[PDB]
C-alpha cells in the first residue's frame, strides 16, 4: 500500500494532518456526545430514565463507562480480577432469618445470587 493510504490519512479513524475529521470525531462521539460517559449517565439515573436500572446491576458509573468503551478481550481481562461473592452469599446467607440477603446495589443480579452451581 502507498503511505498516502496506509499512513497519511487514507485511514479515516487515525488523526493527523490531512485527516482533520478523525480527531474531532474521536473526542465528540466517544466522550462529549456519548451516552455512557459518567456525566451523561448521571443525568438519566433516576425515575423511568434510561439508566435507572444502573442502581441495582452491581456496577459503578465508572465501570459502566469502562465496559462500554473497552473491547471484549480487555473486558475479559478485567473480569479476571473479580470475585463470585454473590455465589458465596448463597453459601452463607442461607437461613430464613437471612431473608436471602442481597446487597441492594446488586438487587437485579438475580441469577448470579441464586444458582445450583455454587451449592454443588
Amino acid at each position: 500500500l502507498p503511505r498516502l493510504i496506509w499512513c497519511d490519512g487514507g485511514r479515516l479513524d487515525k488523526p493527523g494532518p490531512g485527516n482533520l475529521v478523525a480527531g474531532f470525531r474521536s473526542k465528540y462521539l466517544n466522550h462529549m456526545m456519548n451516552i455512557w460517559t459518567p456525566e451523561n449517565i448521571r443525568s438519566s439515573l433516576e425515575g423511568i430514565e434510561n439508566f435507572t436500572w444502573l442502581r441495582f446491576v452491581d456496577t459503578s458509573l465508572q465501570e459502566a463507562y469502562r465496559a462500554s468503551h473497552t473491547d471484549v478481550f480487555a473486558r475479559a481481562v478485567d473480569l479476571a480480577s473479580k470475585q463470585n461473592r454473590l455465589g458465596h452469599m448463597q453459601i452463607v446467607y442461607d437461613e430464613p432469618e437471612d431473608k436471602k440477603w442481597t446487597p441492594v446495589h446488586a438487587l437485579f443480579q438475580i441469577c448470579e445470587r441464586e444458582n445450583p452451581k455454587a451449592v454443588a
Partner: protein
C-alpha cells in the same frame, strides 16, 4: 429542538371528563369519535387499576379514522406513571431471534417493577490527597459551599490510585458500593494545561453539601431485568440489542423473584400497555403465541389496530375479518372508529393548522375542508403546510384560497394519482413488465 412537528403532535390526551369518562366533543386535540374515545377511556381505567391481566382490545376502522390518534391519546393521558410500549408488527420479524421471542420481549417491556431507594453519595472537587506510605491517608474535598477532610481506608487509597485521582477532579463516592467515579475536572482548572487528553471533560464544581442523601423512585421493566441477567454484562445489550433468545429458565426465575419483592413490599408491579400497531402484519404463528401469552398473570393489556377488511391471513391462504384468525378474535373486544363528518374535518384541520402555526383565512379552511371530504383527511392536512410554503413565496401573511388551490394542482391526492396511473397504462410498467418508452 429534536421534537419537530409530527402528525400526532396535537394529540395531548384522550379528552374525556375523567370523573364520568364522557368524551367532550373536542378537547386535548381529539375531535369526534366519542364512542371510540369512551371505549378507550374505559380501557384506561382497566389499565390504571391494573387488576385485569391480558385483555386484548382491537381498534378497527378505515384509514384516517383516528385509530393511531386514539392510541396516542391514551399514551398521553396514561402518563409516564405506566409503561406504554409501541410495537409496529413489522418489527417482530427479527433475524436475531424468533418471532415469538421478539413478542415475549415486547410483552415484558410493558410490565414495570417500581422500587423506592435511598442512595447516599458524596460528590465534590478534590483539594488534595495525602498518603502515609509508612496504609492510611486523607482526602480533602470541597463543594462551592462546604469542605471536609476524610480518612481513607487502604482499599480506598488503592481505588483512588487506580482511578488516577488528582486535585481538581470532581469525584463521586457511592457509600453503598464504595466505588469511585472520576466525573471530570472543574472549570477552574481549565488553565492548568495547554493540551488536554481526549477523555477529559470539564464540569462545574459540585454544590450544596458533600454527602447528599436522596429518595429516588426507580421504574424498571421485566424485560430490562431479563437482559441484565442474560449474560455477565447484559445491561450493554439493552442498547445494542444483541440479546439472543433469552433462555426461559432465566425468565421463570426472574418472575419468581419479582413475586417475592412484591410480597415483601420491596417493589410494586406496574402493569402497562403494549400497543401493536397494524397487527394484521403478524402471521398465524404469531397469533398462536399471543393467545397463550395473554392468559398470564403478568401479561399487560394489549391494544392493537387494524384497517383490513376481510383479507388473507399472513402465513396461510384463507381470508378472515381484519386479517386475523377467528380463534384470535374470540379473545378480543373490538372498538370501531368511523369516517369523519365535514364539521369534524373542519375542526381537525383547525387543530392541525394551529400546531403548524399556519394562519388560514376562513375561505381557505372552507375549501380545504371540502378537499378533505372529497380527497381524504391526510391529503388536506398535507396541503396546510404546503400552502404555507407557497404563500411565503408570495410574502403573504395568511394562506389564501389561491395558495390552497395551487397546492391542490401541484400535489395529487391518491384518487387523482390512481386515475393518472390508468391513463398511463402503457407508459408505466405493468404487472407483466411490459412498457413502451416510445413517444
Amino acid at each position: 429542538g429534536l421534537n419537530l412537528i409530527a402528525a400526532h403532535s396535537h394529540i395531548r390526551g384522550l379528552g374525556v371528563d375523567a370523573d364520568t369518562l364522557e368524551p367532550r366533543p373536542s378537547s386535548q386535540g381529539l375531535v369526534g369519535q366519542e364512542k371510540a374515545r369512551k371505549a378507550a377511556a374505559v380501557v384506561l381505567e382497566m389499565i390504571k387499576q391494573g387488576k385485569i391481566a391480558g385483555r386484548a382490545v382491537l381498534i378497527a376502522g378505515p384509514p384516517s379514522t383516528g385509530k393511531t390518534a386514539i392510541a396516542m391519546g391514551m399514551a398521553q393521558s396514561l402518563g409516564q406513571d405506566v409503561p406504554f410500549t409501541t410495537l409496529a408488527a413489522s418489527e417482530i420479524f427479527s433475524l436475531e431471534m424468533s418471532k415469538t421471542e421478539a413478542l415475549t420481549q415486547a410483552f415484558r417491556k410493558s410490565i414495570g417493577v417500581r422500587i423506592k431507594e435511598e442512595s447516599e453519595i458524596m460528590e465534590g472537587e478534590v483539594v488534595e490527597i495525602q498518603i502515609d506510605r509508612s496504609k492510611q491517608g486523607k482526602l480533602t474535598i470541597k463543594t462551592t459551599d462546604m469542605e471536609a477532610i476524610y480518612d481513607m481506608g487502604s482499599k480506598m487509597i488503592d481505588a483512588m490510585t487506580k482511578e488516577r485521582v488528582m486535585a481538581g477532579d470532581i469525584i463521586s463516592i457511592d457509600k453503598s458500593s464504595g466505588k469511585i467515579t472520576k466525573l471530570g475536572r472543574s472549570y477552574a482548572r481549565s488553565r492548568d494545561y495547554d493540551a488536554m487528553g481526549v477523555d477529559t471533560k470539564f464540569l462545574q464544581c459540585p454544590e450544596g453539601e458533600l454527602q447528599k442523601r436522596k429518595e429516588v423512585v426507580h421504574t424498571v421493566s421485566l424485560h430490562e431485568i431479563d437482559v441484565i441477567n442474560s449474560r455477565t454484562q447484559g445491561f450493554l445489550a439493552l442498547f445494542s440489542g444483541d440479546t439472543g433468545e433469552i433462555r426461559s429458565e432465566i425468565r421463570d426465575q426472574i418472575n419468581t423473584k419479582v413475586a417475592e419483592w412484591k410480597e415483601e413490599g420491596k417493589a410494586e408491579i406496574v402493569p402497562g400497555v403494549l400497543f401493536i400497531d397494524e397487527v394484521h402484519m403478524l402471521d398465524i404463528e404469531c397469533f398462536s403465541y399471543i393467545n397463550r401469552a395473554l392468559e398470564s398473570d403478568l401479561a399487560p393489556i394489549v391494544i392493537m389496530a387494524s384497517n383490513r377488511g376481510v383479507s388473507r391471513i399472513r402465513g396461510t391462504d384463507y381470508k378472515s375479518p381484519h386479517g386475523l384468525p377467528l380463534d384470535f378474535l374470540d379473545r378480543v373486544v373490538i372498538i370501531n372508529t368511523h369516517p369523519y363528518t365535514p364539521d369534524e374535518l373542519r375542526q381537525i384541520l383547525s387543530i392541525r393548522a394551529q400546531e403548524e402555526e399556519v394562519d388560514l383565512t376562513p375561505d381557505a379552511l372552507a375549501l380545504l375542508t371540502k378537499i378533505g371530504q372529497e380527497a381524504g383527511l391526510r391529503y388536506a392536512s398535507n396541503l396546510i403546510t404546503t400552502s404555507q410554503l407557497i404563500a411565503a413565496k408570495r410574502r403573504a401573511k395568511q394562506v389564501g384560497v389561491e395558495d390552497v388551490q395551487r397546492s391542490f394542482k401541484l400535489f395529487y391526492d391518491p384518487a387523482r394519482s390512481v386515475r393518472f396511473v390508468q391513463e398511463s397504462e402503457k407508459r408505466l410498467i405493468g404487472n407483466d413488465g411490459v412498457v413502451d418508452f416510445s413517444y
